[PDB]
């Protein structure tokens, strides 16, 4: 089993497949390819899947017919497993935890992210739908701060998607369910670990939101991801974490400590061989803070269209900057625009 | 060995010591993480060093909960608080040095109005300021003044405890959240039944903490607390936002009735660049100030503080004016730190 | 240990202090004074604090780091204890349960309370902030009915603040957590114990409110305390105990059985050596009952200003009656008034 893991790391496989009826196959560059010539038997698949679990994980797997966990192989790396029943037979899919962190330039992200990465204190939020590259761009941005500054970075992820090696800053990566019992317990102790930047993998409850706000008030850089399309809907979801009586405080605290909200979309390139990351940037200018303090989240979209000199940009302005660069077609810009008539008016204007 | 690393931190004045795998033993001296040795720590050495500080029971809680926060006492060196944690399935710990020497108000060169406030019998005193402006340092110095100049019981609820005051004229009960109490709210709820004469809340972060502080002052006890806000006006704005708008009318009335003073603190560098001086903005609850508080006219506070310097009040511009005339700050540092660079330039020229 | 309790009762100490680092000290007349000459060791403090708990209280104290309970010493009296961890060391504060009940005249309460104390059936509610003397004035009023009538008084408190000796009425004092499992269980059995007056220590839930309403319908005198500033806000909190569909019944039941709502404030005397109890009285006149039946709680404040002949009085009318008596200054009246302009108009009018 340990030999199959080294082959995946040496060959750069994205995912390993262990199920009955097919040989051990790995997805290398998106192509499922068999590793051996002999398919796995139901007994060998049941012996291989259960052999990776401990006594408690074997109990949860037999009761719930499913079990998702993570493992750490000494000297090889880490990988996330998704075990499952299939046709009343055991099966598991393993995903290698990547370590080669792309840079902000390799992702072709705007330069305002670099200034945000070197910020000393504040709250930065990565919004976007599922799989829009939020964690990918965040880890790329995390590598920028790790390489360009000195300090301590504390990470709480569920799961850890990228493992950053110790560069200029000390990097402590903790995964929920292995290194900590929950997000709340880790963030509660993150303050006493003398961090300089704290990255919450995802804010899913009000307790996670309170810790993120308290992190920024103490002069630390707080980063987190949340599932929302743009900056306006992200603020709407955050305020709904709290009862209405605490909204007045939430609007005031958000207007005081927030630094930026980065919304990310993935639009296909003209050649169809890849996807480009569209970034909507909202910087906390004094006018934006007043709109936040008043809860006038509706007034945010017009304000971002007039302050492009400070570093802000909507999705229509970012798509306008990418279509003029030739990185996206004309049809892809109008289909991905927040307003297909404004983007058509923005492109026709110059 | 380990005891030698503690003496080096005390002799070099390190704020925090870092013990984790992948990086050499590093200490945060003056906010800069610096390695102590040249050889990084191995996972076995980090696991042997972290577990070596725990007893048999702390090693059991650490293995079950993946986290363990505790405190230790080294004979002849001092005390330090540790925050152990799992990180990438590896052990790690951060140690924070606890300070036992409590300075005096004269050593901090604080205004004499603080001494009269320290000996007050009942009321609410609030320390405002940005992160690291010496709020807790000046408060502990003020706490040592009341502890040495009066008889009674002082109850302290901190997160964490930054200074440990020995029993002087008053009985000093220091309780830290997470070790001596489960939360700020639980400790303040029981603080009333412990017969205190002065109660110091480490920081007010919610409305429940604010309600207890108000109830503490109504019962004839001296209540002190810290909050993160630049000046007195913004501190009042943040406090009222803790509550829904329907309860604002009561909050303005209660604040106008029990409040004693609001002390805003700024740190300006001395002319020689070798240190920083604490600038103190003092707002005393005169009858005119109480009426402005009862009406919610927080905007009318800044002009009122400029005309009542005889009673003990002073703005940041008046305090910076008193320090620049003393030679404790340059002319450029006064205009850059002034709330109004034109008023301070007019105050100095007058 | 039993000798230290007798010394506190013989010397009239308000609170006894048992913590490491200081001798056993008692707060007599507000002055913390040491009893012995030798301070207590951590082992002696740990042996004294844990020695008062049973096996279960020692388990809750070790797990939660805090434990509040009550004890009964045969032949001495009762005292409430608040144990706590402090600097990872045990400590406890003991408060003596007072038995010398002040009378209504000693508290200088209005005579309408005497007529309310001798009432046969109905609901009387003591409102006020934390520590406004609600339980103190109630126990004083309880001693009036106990001494001036014959019957059975049933008390459910959490905790019992005053212990009334058997006078004209039979006095059964039950404390939650020692004499009963909960407020609901005690009130459920209070009906089958043939009472004539039932005092609920505090109404904190709807189940407690339902029992109080049912107590008054059965021809018994029901008294209870709740935390609210005045009569209007007390009614708002009571109706919010119930869903909106049951509000129509609650308004009708309140208009039918309620007798009075007594709001209490504590204003300092001119000499600054004490505090005087300000009492806002709202009597259930037919016009008030109609405003209650319609839910027009807003219409209550104007009605109380016009029916001073029946025994009602607002906070502004009571403060007007105390300022004319010389028991409060002119500045203390305008600062504590519900309307500083109406009280200024009430005082200027005569």
Numbering used by the authors:
A (entry chain D), C (entry chain D): 3 to 352
B (entry chain A): 2 to 351
From the paper:
Many functions of Pseudomonas aeruginosa type IVa pili, including twitching motility and surface sensing, depend on dynamic cycles of filament assembly and disassembly powered by the cytoplasmic ATPases PilB, PilT, and PilU. Single-cell imaging using iSCAT microscopy confirmed that pilU mutants grown in liquid retract their pili in a PilT-dependent manner, suggesting that while not essential for filament disassembly, PilU may be needed to generate additional force when pili are tethered to a surface and thus under higher loads.
To uncover the unique role of P. aeruginosa PilU, we first determined its crystal structure. While the overall domain organization and distinctive C3 symmetric hexameric architecture were clearly resolved, individual side chains could not be confidently modeled and were therefore not included. Based on our previous definitions of packing unit interfaces formed by adjacent protomers, the PilU C3 hexamer has alternating open (O) and closed (C) subunits, mirroring the C3-symmetric OCOCOC conformation of Geobacter metallireducens PilT. While the first 30 of these C-terminal PilU residues remain structurally conserved, the last 30—typically absent in PilT—are predicted to be disordered by ESpritz and were unresolved in the crystal structure. Structural predictions suggest that these residues extend outward rather than integrating into the hexameric core, and recent Alphafold modeling studies suggested that this segment of PilU may stabilize its interaction with PilT. These data support the conclusion that it is a motor protein that assists PilT in pilus retraction under high loads, a hypothesis supported by recent studies showing that while pilU mutants can retract their pili, they generate reduced retraction forces compared to wild-type cells.
